[PDB]
Structures are given as structure tokens and as C-alpha cells.
């Protein structure tokens, strides 16, 4: 019941270790260790068989076998129902008292989810057999008065430290395309016809580390870019892209929203591999993927989706609903002021957001024979309640950057209020 700032797709969440069922259903045993004595409980693996626990909201597709394959893509887990890993606990009772040693089997809880438009449509919980838990305490009195107690509710409880690690995986039903040659400063890729049938991922790497602008020729549809987790510093060839079938992906930036006309500004390192996910294009006209290495302080947009705002030639509110970046991340908006350019002529604007809070930076986009350049016009320490207006030259282009500071809703709404 919390906001998950990620694009549509599959995710595997390591929800922590130390999970066990209620009513001692995972109790291995208890030892009464008398003073000056030592007790020990062992899982020697004389048999390597382990018993995983599985729960799914859709048996047909999110089957145990399917879920296991996802866990393999996320964390590369090899053994699901066997183990050669031994665990053992040892305790010595003091000279003054007796000790009670309770030992239980445990599980690591992995959650597999199908996340669509801020919502979970399917869910599976895989409990990977773990290395147990041991509770030692002062031995109870054999005389302690017995208290009738109703059995607890059927279920799990967490015993290990708090953990929540999200890892995205390539959607196995969307194909993967590959740009074999490390891309240079400029590159154009023709999107295959299969795009008409389903979204695909384009795997690639850059020849030179730096910031890049990535987009379709009409800034439509919106793109999403990921990093192949663990891809850096493995096999490498200067003239070819060495694939490692890494299906674990880290979301950098991008949106799913259909009408979100935009392009991406991201930081790319040559020693890594990346995936760009192109939505399904239900059109017969061939689309293209354009890559361009940007020199200049356009890098300030450091890993951001730049939304091009439409219909700015009116007065009042101008809203834009977009999937909100996570706390600390960016989301940008490009504005070409209505009217013709002649330094003097201007219009008054007031920038705000509505669901989520953040820090704003207003840039004046300029041109040079050395690429683009940004000139900071102003900064805003409060966007949810900003009232300070500002005048912008007509026919000029501005980019507003938002750094999310408070994630209250799945979507963040941007408002380019035109006072005049």
C-alpha cells in the first residue's frame, strides 16, 4: 500500500529473510541446555532436499516454474529446492542457569509482480528455503502455570532485518533486438516491423562515455531506458557488443503514457550495456531511434525525460499528468513560448506541481556551434505552493527541471500557468 515509482513491467522484490509460518509450523526443535553444559542443533544436509513455499494470484501464467525463471533473471538463483549449505547453532549455558534453545527453518520472501499503470495486476510470492533462526533465552519453569491460548492466524511473520530490494526483469514476452556495433556520436536505428505486434527492447552500448539525447523522429512514442545490472567490466570487444543475457534491469528514465511527446537525456558509460524499450507501434510507417551525444551543460538534465508541452497559446492553467519519478530523481518539461521572437516581447508564467513536491530549476535553452547550452533563470524550493511568477521571451524555449522531494502519488502533475 505504497507508491512504486516504476514503469509498467515485471519486478522481483526481495522482501527479506527470516520469514516463517505461525503456530510453530517451521519449528525444528527445542533444546533444554542445563547450566555448565553446551547444546547444539544442526542442519547437516545429509539430504540436500529443501521445501520451497509458493503462492500465486494466477496459476496459469504466474506458475511456480514461471516465477522461478523470473527469480533466476533477477538474482540469478540456481538452486530452488536443494541446498548443500549447512547451518548450525551452538550455545553454552552459564553456571547459574538453564538455557532454552529454539531453532526454526526460515525463508527469504521474493515477490513477483506484474505492474501496470500504477497497479499490480498479478502477484506471486516465492519463499526460498533459508538458513534458519535461533532463539535462546532463560529456560522456562517446568512449573509455570499453563495458560489456554487460541492458535494464531494462519500465515507468515518476518524475523530477519528489514529489507526491500526491487529488481526489474526483461518482460520475457517482448523480444530483444541488438545493435551489434558500439554506437558513435550519432546513430539512427530503424525499428523492425515486429514493433507492430508488441513492444521490444533494443540492447546496445556507447563507444564514448557521456550524455546522450535519445528519441523517435516525432518524439513519439515515449521511450524507456534501462541499465543491464552487472553488465560492466565483463567480456568486451571494441568493435562488437558482447551479450551476457543479463535479464536484470535497472530503470534509468522514461514514461509509458501514450501522448507524452518527449525525448531522453541520459548519462551513458561505455563499459555498460543498456536497453531501450520501444512500445508497440500500431502503424505501418517505419519509426526510428535516434542517438546523439550531447556536449555542453545540457548534461544538467542528468538522466531525465524531457516532456514537450503542447497548447501553450491560452491563458490560465496548463496541466500535464506524468508518472512521477522517485524521490531524488528528475522529470523535465520543454517550453517554446507562444509568439514571435524579438528579445523584448514576453509572457508571464507561474510553475507549480499538484500531487508531488519537489525542487524546480528553470533553464533558458540556447544554441551554439558547440551544441546546446542552458542558462539558469531561477530555482524554486517549493513547487506545490509556488506563486512567484516570471516573464519569458516569446518565441524562446525554456526547460523546467523537477527533482522530486515528496512522493505522495503515482503521478506528478505539472502546471505551466500563463498569467499573460
Amino acid at each position: 500500500q505504497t507508491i512504486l515509482p516504476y514503469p509498467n513491467g515485471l519486478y522481483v522484490i526481495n522482501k527479506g529473510d527470516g520469514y516463517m509460518r505461525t503456530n510453530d509450523k517451521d519449528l525444528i526443535g527445542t533444546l533444554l541446555i542445563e547450566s555448565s553444559t553446551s547444546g547444539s542443533i544442526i542442519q547437516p544436509r545429509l539430504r540436500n532436499t529443501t521445501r520451497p513455499l509458493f503462492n500465486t494470484s494466477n496459476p496459469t501464467i504466474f506458475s511456480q516454474e514461471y516465477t522461478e525463471a523470473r527469480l533466476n533473471d533477477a538474482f540469478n538463483i540456481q538452486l530452488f529446492n536443494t541446498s548443500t549449505t549447512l547451518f548450525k547453532f551452538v550455545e553454552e549455558a552459564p553456571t547459574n542457569k538453564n538455557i532454552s534453545m529454539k531453532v526454526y527453518n526460515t525463508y527469504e520472501k521474493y515477490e513477483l509482480i506484474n505492474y501496470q499503470n500504477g497497479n499490480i495486476d498479478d502477484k506471486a510470492e516465492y519463499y526460498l528455503p533459508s538458513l534458519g533462526k535461533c532463539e535462546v533465552s532463560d529456560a522456562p519453569s517446568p512449573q509455570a502455570p499453563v495458560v489456554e491460548t487460541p492458535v494464531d492466524q494462519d500465515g507468515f511473520i518476518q524475523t530477519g532485518p528489514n529489507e526491500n530490494i526491487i529488481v526489474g526483469v526483461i518482460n520475457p514476452s517482448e523480444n530483444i533486438e541488438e545493435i551489434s556495433t558500439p554506437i558513435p556520436d550519432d546513430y539512427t536505428y530503424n525499428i523492425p516491423t515486429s514493433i507492430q505486434n508488441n513492444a521490444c527492447y533494443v540492447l546496445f552500448k556507447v563507444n564514448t562515455t557521456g550524455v546522450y539525447k535519445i528519441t523517435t523522429k516525432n518524439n513519439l512514442p515515449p521511450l524507456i531506458i534501462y541499465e543491464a545490472i552487472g553488465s560492466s567490466n565483463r567480456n568486451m570487444n571494441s568493435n562488437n557488443l558482447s551479450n551476457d543475457n543479463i535479464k536484470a534491469i535497472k530503470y534509468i528514465t522514461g514514461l509509458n503514457r501514450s501522448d507524452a511527446k518527449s525525448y531522453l537525456i541520459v548519462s551513458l558509460f561505455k563499459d555498460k550495456n543498456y536497453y531501450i524499450r520501444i512500445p508497440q507501434i500500431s502503424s505501418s510507417t517505419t519509426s526510428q531511434l535516434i542517438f546523439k551525444r550531447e556536449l555542453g551543460n545540457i548534461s544538467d538534465l542528468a538522466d531525465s525525460t524531457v516532456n514537450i508541452l503542447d497548447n501553450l497559446n491560452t491563458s490560465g492553467t496548463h496541466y500535464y499528468t506524468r508518472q512521477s519519478p522517485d524521490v531524488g530523481n528528475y522529470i523535465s518539461y520543454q517550453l517554446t513560448i507562444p509568439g514571435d521572437f524579438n528579445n523584448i516581447a514576453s509572457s508571464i508564467f507561474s510553475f507549480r506541481t499538484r500531487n508531488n513536491q519537489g525542487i524546480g530549476t528553470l533553464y533558458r535553452l540556447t544554441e551554439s556551434i558547440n551544441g546546446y547550452n542552458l542558462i539558469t533563470i531561477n530555482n524554486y524550493s517549493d513547487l506545490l505552493n509556488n506563486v512567484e511568477p516570471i516573464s519569458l521571451l516569446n518565441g524562446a524555449t525554456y526547460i523546467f527541471r523537477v527533482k522530486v522531494t515528496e512522493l505522495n502519488n503515482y503521478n506528478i502533475i505539472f502546471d505551466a500557468y500563463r498569467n499573460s
Binding site: 527445542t30 533444546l31 553444559t37 544442526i42 542442519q43 517446568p142 492458535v151
Partner: protein
């Protein structure tokens, strides 16, 4: 007496706790003898082949009825029995005397009770092999030992007894 329960009328499955040792089985696994500061160690593996449950059924509750109702609410011992588990105890003998310690299996006591008028009318019992427990005493060939040390005439719990229930349905 032990048949008075503040429970509604019906059938219940009860977890009486872990740590139960059985009547007169005290020395069935043998004992160990050491001396002069030596460390003695005894251990075991409750392999499925040895660790066998003890059923005490009644008219209303037969072996099958007891098993399914226990493995439904509490730990499924039939499954777990396929995975070998070990335990051991160690103790240092006194500097100038002898140490004797013996081992015996511990159990989880489950009960299937029939209640009528806040009193137990029928009671089935199941002992599921848990782990083990050792008892030790220091000695010399002259010393006289209390026989309660070597013998347990009535089933009992070395830990505090428990009463965790759940009413059976249908």
C-alpha cells in the same frame, strides 16, 4: 482435575508443547562416562527411520484423524521427517571426579480433546519426535544415586507445558 477446560463444547486439537520425555525410556540410547577435565560429547540424528511417532487413539479419534488435524494446524511432521536433523550436548568432567551423562529423545505432545460441559470427555495423544535431552551427574564408584535420576515413571515436560488450541470443524 486436568480435565477441566474453559472451552466451548466441541472437538479441539491442542499443542501441549515441545520438551516431553517418555516414561521409563530414560537410558534406551546408552550413557557416556568421562573424567579429569575431559570434554564429553553425545549427539544424534533423528533420521526418519528411527524417529517414529507414538499414537494413543480413542474411539472418536483414530490415528488418521489425529495426524491430519495436527499437520493441518501445526508443524507437518510427516514431511519434515525426510530431512535429517542433528543435535548434540557437551560437558566438561570435573578435575578429580567422574562425569556420567545419558541421552533420550524429546517430543512434542499433541492432543485431540472432546469437550462437554467445560470438561474433557475423551483425549487422544500423539508424541512427535522432536530432538533430545541429556542428564548428567558427577560420581565415584562409591556414591549412591537417587533413582529418579535414571528413571521417569510418568510422561512429563522438561520445559513449561502448553495449551495452544483450535476447535475442529465438521
Amino acid at each position: 482435575s486436568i480435565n477441566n477446560v474453559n472451552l466451548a463444547d466441541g472437538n479441539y486439537v491442542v499443542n501441549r508443547g515441545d520438551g516431553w520425555i517418555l516414561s521409563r525410556q530414560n537410558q534406551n540410547l546408552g550413557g557416556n562416562i568421562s573424567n579429569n577435565g575431559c570434554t564429553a560429547i553425545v549427539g544424534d540424528l533423528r533420521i526418519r527411520e528411527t524417529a517414529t511417532p507414538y499414537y494413543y487413539p480413542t474411539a472418536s479419534f483414530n490415528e488418521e484423524y489425529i495426524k491430519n488435524n495436527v499437520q493441518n494446524v501445526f508443524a507437518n511432521f510427516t514431511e519434515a521427517s525426510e530431512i535429517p536433523i542433528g543435535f548434540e550436548f557437551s560437558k566438561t568432567a570435573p578435575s578429580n571426579k567422574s562425569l556420567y551423562m545419558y541421552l533420550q529423545y524429546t517430543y512434542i505432545r499433541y492432543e485431540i480433546i472432546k469437550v462437554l460441559q467445560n470438561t474433557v470427555t475423551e483425549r487422544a495423544v500423539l508424541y512427535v519426535p522432536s530432538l533430545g535431552y541429556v542428564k548428567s551427574i558427577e560420581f565415584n564408584s562409591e556414591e549412591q544415586i537417587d533413582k529418579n535420576f535414571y528413571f521417569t515413571s510418568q510422561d512429563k515436560c522438561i520445559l513449561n507445558e502448553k495449551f495452544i488450541y483450535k476447535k475442529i470443524d465438521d
